Amino acid sequence: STNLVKNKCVNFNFNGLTGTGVLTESNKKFLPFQQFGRDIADTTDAVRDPQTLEILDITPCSFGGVSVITPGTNTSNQVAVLYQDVNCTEV
Amino acid sequence: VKQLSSNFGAISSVLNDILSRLDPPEAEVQIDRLITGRLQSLQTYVTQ
């Protein structure tokens, strides 16, 4: 077993629940016997950790496409880059 | 998305479960069964 870090893309493992993503603290309230949550489409979006008895939100680790804006190579060699639906801090 | 949880004739739907109870020569055969199914489903989505 080991400590738990929050707000970073990690590879987590809770009891056998295996995935990767960023873990934050939440405003859900499970039922004492409930061990993890999942949403429509049945993806895990919350979990309970088996030592603090606190529930944590799971968010996939940012991803997206990359597009390059070219004014035409017959005019210049400059380009701009768009990182699609990504906040600017994470590049 | 609901098709990401079908076996298509494999031991599970998770790649971290075929890469944990099978040696590489046996996990190829089980990964290909998932690849074929998921490709079929994506291409049906793109035709419709």
Binding site: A41, T43, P60, F63, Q84 | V1
Partner: peptide
């Protein structure tokens, strides 16, 4: 135009339209 606007994950993304 208001009454009308009130009446009506893993590799998947939604792109915004060019005209708002």
């Amino acid at each position: 135009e208001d009454l009308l606007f009130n009446k009506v994950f893993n590799g998947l993304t939604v792109l915004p339209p060019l005209l708002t």
